[PDB]
Amino acid sequence: RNAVPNQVTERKFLVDRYLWQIPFSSNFLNMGTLTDLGQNVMYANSSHSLN
Amino acid sequence: LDRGPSFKPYGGTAYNPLAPKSAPINSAFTVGNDTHFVAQLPQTYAAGGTG
Secondary structure (H helix, E strand, C coil), X not given: CCCCCCCCCXXXXXXXXXXXXXXXXXXXXXCCCCCCCCCXXXXXXXXXXXX | CCCXXXXXXXXXXXXXXXXXXXXXXXXXEEECCEEEEECCCCCCCXXXXXX
């Protein structure tokens, strides 16, 4: 009945046992185990760094 | 969003939850003419008669 006004909201989440992933694909889907950018001519027959 | 005064998201209470429900706190209440004291004095000190 007499709750305090002007209170503010706080949100968070908790994942356990998950180990976040970014797939190395064009549309981030699972179209094959060998992905589509892995057999690309830009990435296979070249040499790149990563940072 | 407002939820009105009809919102209480739990059972029981959050203030003095271990008390019996008929228990009064140490108060002074007036019945008609003059006040009635009801109290509990847990902490004591030293008196020596006509203290």
